[PDB]
Amino acid sequence: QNPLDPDEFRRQGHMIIDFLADYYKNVEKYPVRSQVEPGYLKKRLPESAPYNPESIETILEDVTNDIIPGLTHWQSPNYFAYFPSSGSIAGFLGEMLSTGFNVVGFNWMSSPAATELESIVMNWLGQMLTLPKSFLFSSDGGGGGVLQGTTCEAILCTLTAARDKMLNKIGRENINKLVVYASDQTHCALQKAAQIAGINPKNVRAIKTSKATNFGLSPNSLQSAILADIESGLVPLFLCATVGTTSSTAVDPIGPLCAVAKLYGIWVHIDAAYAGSACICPEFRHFIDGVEDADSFSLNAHKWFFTTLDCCCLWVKDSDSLVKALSTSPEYLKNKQVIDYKDWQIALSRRFRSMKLWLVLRSYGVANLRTFLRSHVKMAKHFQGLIGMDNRFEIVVPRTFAMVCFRLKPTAIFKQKIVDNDYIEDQTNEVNVKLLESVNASGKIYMTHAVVGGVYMIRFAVGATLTEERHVTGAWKVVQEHTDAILG
Amino acid sequence: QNPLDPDEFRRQGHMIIDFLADYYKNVEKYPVRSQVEPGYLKKRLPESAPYNPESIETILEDVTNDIIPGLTHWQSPNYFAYFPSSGSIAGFLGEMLSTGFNVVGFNWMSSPAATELESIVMNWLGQMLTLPKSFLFSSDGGGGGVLQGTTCEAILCTLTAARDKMLNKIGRENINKLVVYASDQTHCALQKAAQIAGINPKNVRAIKTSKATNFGLSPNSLQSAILADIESGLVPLFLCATVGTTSSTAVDPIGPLCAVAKLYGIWVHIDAAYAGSACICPEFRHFIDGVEDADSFSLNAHKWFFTTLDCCCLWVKDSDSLVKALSTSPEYLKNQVIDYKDWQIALSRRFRSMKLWLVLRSYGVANLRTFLRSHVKMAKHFQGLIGMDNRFEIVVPRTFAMVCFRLKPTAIFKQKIVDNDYIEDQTNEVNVKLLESVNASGKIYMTHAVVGGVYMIRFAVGATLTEERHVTGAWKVVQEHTDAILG
Numbered sequence: 025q026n027p028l029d030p031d032e033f034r035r036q037g038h039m040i041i042d043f044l045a046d047y048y049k050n051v052e053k054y055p056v057r058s059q060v061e062p063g064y065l066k067k068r069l070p071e072s073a074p075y076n077p078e079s080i081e082t083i084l085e086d087v088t089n090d091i092i093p094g095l096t097h098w099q100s101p102n103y104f105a106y107f108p109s110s111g112s113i114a115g116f117l118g119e120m121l122s123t124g125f126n127v128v129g130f131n132w133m134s135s136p137a138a139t140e141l142e143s144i145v146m147n148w149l150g151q152m153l154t155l156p157k158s159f160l161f162s163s164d165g166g167g168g169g170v171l172q173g174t175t176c177e178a179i180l181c182t183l184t185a186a187r188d189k190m191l192n193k194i195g196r197e198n199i200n201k202l203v204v205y206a207s208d209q210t211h212c213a214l215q216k217a218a219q220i221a222g223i224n225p226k227n228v229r230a231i232k233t234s235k236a237t238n239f240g241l242s243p244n245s246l247q248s249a250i251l252a253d254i255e256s257g258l259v260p261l262f263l264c265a266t267v268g269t270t271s272s273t274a275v276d277p278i279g280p281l282c283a284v285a286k287l288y289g290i291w292v293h294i295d296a297a298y299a300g301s302a303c304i305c306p307e308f309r310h311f312i313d314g315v316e317d318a319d320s321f322s323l324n325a326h327k328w329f330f331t332t333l334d335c336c337c338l339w340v341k342d343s344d345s346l347v348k349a350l351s352t353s354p355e356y357l358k359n360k361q362v363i364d365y366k367d368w369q370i371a372l373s374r375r376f377r378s379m380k381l382w383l384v385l386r387s388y389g390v391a392n393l394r395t396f397l398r399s400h401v402k403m404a405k406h407f408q409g410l411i412g413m414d415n416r417f418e419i420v421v422p423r424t425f426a427m428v429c430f431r432l433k434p435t436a437i438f439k440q441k442i443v444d445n446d447y448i449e450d451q452t453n454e455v456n457v458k459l460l461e462s463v464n465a466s467g468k469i470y471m472t473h474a475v476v477g478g479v480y481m482i483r484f485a486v487g488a489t490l491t492e493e494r495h496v497t498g499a500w501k502v503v504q505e506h507t508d509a510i511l512g
Numbered sequence: 513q514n515p516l517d518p519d520e521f522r523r524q525g526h527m528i529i530d531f532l533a534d535y536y537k538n539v540e541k542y543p544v545r546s547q548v549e550p551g552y553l554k555k556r557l558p559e560s561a562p563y564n565p566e567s568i569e570t571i572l573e574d575v576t577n578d579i580i581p582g583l584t585h586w587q588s589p590n591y592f593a594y595f596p597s598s599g600s601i602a603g604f605l606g607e608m609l610s611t612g613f614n615v616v617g618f619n620w621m622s623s624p625a626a627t628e629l630e631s632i633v634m635n636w637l638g639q640m641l642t643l644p645k646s647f648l649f650s651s652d653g654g655g656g657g658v659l660q661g662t663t664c665e666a667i668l669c670t671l672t673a674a675r676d677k678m679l680n681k682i683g684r685e686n687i688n689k690l691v692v693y694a695s696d697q698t699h700c701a702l703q704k705a706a707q708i709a710g711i712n713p714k715n716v717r718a719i720k721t722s723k724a725t726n727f728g729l730s731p732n733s734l735q736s737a738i739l740a741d742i743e744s745g746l747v748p749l750f751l752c753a754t755v756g757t758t759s760s761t762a763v764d765p766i767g768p769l770c771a772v773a774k775l776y777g778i779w780v781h782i783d784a785a786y787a788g789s790a791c792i793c794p795e796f797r798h799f800i801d802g803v804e805d806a807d808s809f810s811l812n813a814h815k816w817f818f819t820t821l822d823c824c825c826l827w828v829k830d831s832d833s834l835v836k837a838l839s840t841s842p843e844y845l846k847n848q849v850i851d852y853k854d855w856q857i858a859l860s861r862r863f864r865s866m867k868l869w870l871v872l873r874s875y876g877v878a879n880l881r882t883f884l885r886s887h888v889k890m891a892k893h894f895q896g897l898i899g900m901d902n903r904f905e906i907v908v909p910r911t912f913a914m915v916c917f918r919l920k921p922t923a924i925f926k927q928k929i930v931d932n933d934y935i936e937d938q939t940n941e942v943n944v945k946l947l948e949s950v951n952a953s954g955k956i957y958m959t960h961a962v963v964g965g966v967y968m969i970r971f972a973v974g975a976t977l978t979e980e981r982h983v984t985g986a987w988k989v990v991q992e993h994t995d996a997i998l999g
């Protein structure tokens with residue numbers, strides 16, 4: 025009858041829960057990387073909507089037969105690609121409570137709980153991160169934090185804030201002279217955000233890094249680029265320093281970076297999308313030292329903090345700049361020192377995201393969360409040791425968190441006393457391409473690659489919530505079998 | 513043990529299904545608009561995270577005692593504020609499946625099903641809307657559609673596409689001469705997009721509208737604006753025409769607006785966030801006549817299409833512009849298909865096509881039409897109830913399922929004098945009092961609008977749980993509070 029019948033809700037919801045419990049019980053059974061051909065689904069499904077209803081049972085049969093073959097199982101214990109899609113029972117339950125309530129929190133009045141819980145919970149997490157008080161919500165009133173969907177949106181919001189702060193002082197006609205700084209390892213979330221914000225594409229500086237800094241941004245290189253831009257009559261605006269780059273999880277030195285930036289009034293945003301969460305543990309916190317000298321800081325709680333997709337956390341030292349850049353107060357939504365979160369982000373409508381984070385924190389506790397992260401790190405260390413037992417491979421850059429970067433060495437295919445050169449390195453790159461593709465095609469595990477300084481290398485990024493030690497051991501076994509077979 | 517243990521997952525998920533089923537069974541009892549004081553919740557929760565774990569039973573108890581009181585119940589059958597937060601069992605189940613797979617679909621490779629099902633379902637819905645083929649996916653590989661979070665994101669995307677397509681021709685130094693046209697009813701989501709995209713604030717025209725066109729944008733006003741801007745040496749760029757404005761669900765006339773725009777190469781985006789869904793019914797398709805002469809089209813399926821929050825559908829005639837303005841080619845995501853990362857803002861995508869797929873499959877075209885028609889019918893009934901009471905008037909015509917009404921000036925002025933500014937101000941104050949009294953009762957919730965100076969009350973009916981009796985009881989509450997204010 026009604027699409028929100030409570031009893032039908034109970035029934036079908038129980039059905040879907042059983043379905044997902046089965047899926048988690050069975051996921052290790054599928055090939056990690058989808059093995060379908062492009063366009064398979066367009067062929068297997070109808071071309072128009074149904075006129076009459078269809079049973080939920082039918083739709084679930086179709087989910088099993090048609091959808092799942094087309095999934096890359098990010099939550100498989102044998103998923104090691106990109107960065108983890110960190111999920112959890114608590115995260116799922118928080119998402120489902122938010123979707124059940126289905127409220128729209130664009131201002132305080134549309135649901136006081138959404139806004140106030142988000143404030144409380146961001147303070148919680150930021151305190152766990154031991155962020156400086158200048159970034160948290162002061163009860164005596166400055167700083168503050170907000171939940172957004174993605175890192176790209178957080179960078180876009182802080183970039184727009186910086187842009188408007190500067191152009192209000194010097195005049196919009198300088199918009200095409202504004203310069204954004206990052207490293208050549210910096211995630212594309214930055215150049216996309218710069219494009220959308222109207223920064224001229226000639227003024228996004230991907231500063232060159234090298235093995236001498238383990239591909240972190242050199243402060244001397246940043247200062248040279250800044251001085252060149254000043255000499256050309258341009259306007260330095262924004263630096264995006266990164267903790268845990270996508271390629272090799274390199275780590276930028278935030279302290280000296282901000283020290284250079286303050287010399288020129290540059291806004292500094294800290295992209296710690298993946299690695300940020302590890303900083304709740306005392307032994308990892310040093311990676312974000314100097315954050316106190318930066319202007320904004322973000323992490324992706326869905327990459328390594330079990331929330332489920334999606335939940336990016338953005339803390340700012342000067343929330344008024346966010347608000348001023350993004351604010352619009354029409355009359356339909358005006359109908360007191362409250363927070364209107366629509367003025368902190370892109371979207372007007374907002375999802376009750378604080379629920380996921382709240383439920384994760386409460387269900388597991390700081391101790392168990394730290395244990396989870398340390399489990400991932402210990403598994404990565406174990407993988408690196410296994411590699412250390414095979415002189416055919418090397419570690420290309422130091423393991424900073426739970427990602428290991430490795431490759432077959434040149435001496436694994438060139439049995440000669442010849443000095444390295446470009447051709448030898450290219451052929452080594454080729455055999456590593458071949459090895460990774462063979463492994464992925466097996467379907468037993470899934471890893472992605474990255475090129476740093478011309479060296480092509482394989483990333484083992486362990487963090488899937490279901491992963492256990494045996495999956496690490498088995499993954500190494502698979503790499504070794506495919507190595508043996510490729511090298512005869 | 514494991515934070516994703518399947519047994520514990522099954523147990524706590526069943527518990528949560530039951531908790532939410534009880535919520536829907538009992539939601540009618542809470543005051544619709546939240547009644548808590550600002551700062552209420554901080555007082556009740558700890559100021560730091562817990563070091564030890566906490567039972568899900570305890571968390572659920574805290575949700576009942578601490579969270580729900582701070583909710584404004586968008587899904588109460590007596591909620592008629594803003595526009596509906598339209599949901600359904602099917603949408604909830606689609607979101608469940610999405611979150612349970614928890615896959616990121618920035619690549620096709622990162623989960624072909626996400627990408628392909630999104631394309632298929634956008635075709636389905638565009639076909640139900642009778643969108644021109646120029647807006648849908650060619651089976652042979654022209655146009656196409658993408659799911660997103662909000663209408664603001666859709667407008668930001670199309671505006672970025674138009675901006676970059678223009679500046680690629682004339683040079684980025686002209687960014688400060690690009691003009692964006694809208695009506696003075698146009699949702700602020702457009703002004704925000706213009707600010708973000710670098711459009712100069714002096715160059716967003718909020719063209720004035722009057723009761724003469726029921727506050728729809730007039731082609732002659734738009735053309736005067738565009739000509740004046742051309743005379744100033746500015747560069748007209750982008751028009752946002754709205755079908756179903758927030759304030760009074762006015763309807764800009766897409767046809768002649770596009771005819772004016774095409775004379776100047778202006779990109780036309782059709783914002784149909786709320787009313788767009790209604791066009792899956794034949795009798796409503798006329799509201800988007802001339803969409804074929806436009807450049808992009810969007811609606812919010814979470815407003816009037818039962819998907820759950822959130823889902824905004826955006827179609828375009830030229831996806832190449834979208835991709836060329838939003839494209840990035842990075843080395844970390846490679847080793848002919850759609851890569852939707854180049855169609856929207858973020859790299860990460862939610863498996864959003866599952867919500868829409870489940871809604872369409874679970875209900876059907878016929879039943880969805882009947883749902884929307886029921887909302888429209890309840891709105892007609894509320895309008896007739898108003899008609900039975902000569903203290904009230906209908907300020908503008910009902911286009912969809914929202915009725916805009918007010919206490920007439922003759923309800924508070926016995927005098928037989930010609931209307932003037934003071935009388936209208938006092939009538940506004942009376943209607944303010946009426947709306948705030950109604951809303952503070954907690955029994956129902958409506959929001960206000962101001963069109964051409966006149967302050968009026970919106971009855972926007974479309975919550976999934978609303979029945980005829982809720983409409984009737986809403987009118988009873990309005991009349992009781994009116995008598996209490998007058999006699």
Ligand SMILES: Cc1ncc(COP(=O)(O)O)c(CN[C@@H](Cc2ccc(O)cc2)C(=O)O)c1O
Pocket residue numbers: 128130357371372373594595596597598661662663664665699701754756757758783784785786812814815821824
């Ligand atoms: C014409 C138009 N465009 C856009 C929007 C909203 O754009 P976003 O996707 O960025 O949110 C609205 C509704 N605006 C109201 C009403 C509303 C009602 C229900 C919802 O689920 C969402 C919004 C509001 O957001 O305040 C609108 O009427």
Ligand SMILES: N[C@@H](Cc1ccc(O)cc1)C(=O)O
Pocket residue numbers: 106107108109110270326327333616844859860
């Ligand atoms: N953004 C990540 C992919 C990713 C996103 C979200 C996740 O939860 C996990 C991984 C990348 O570029 O590699």
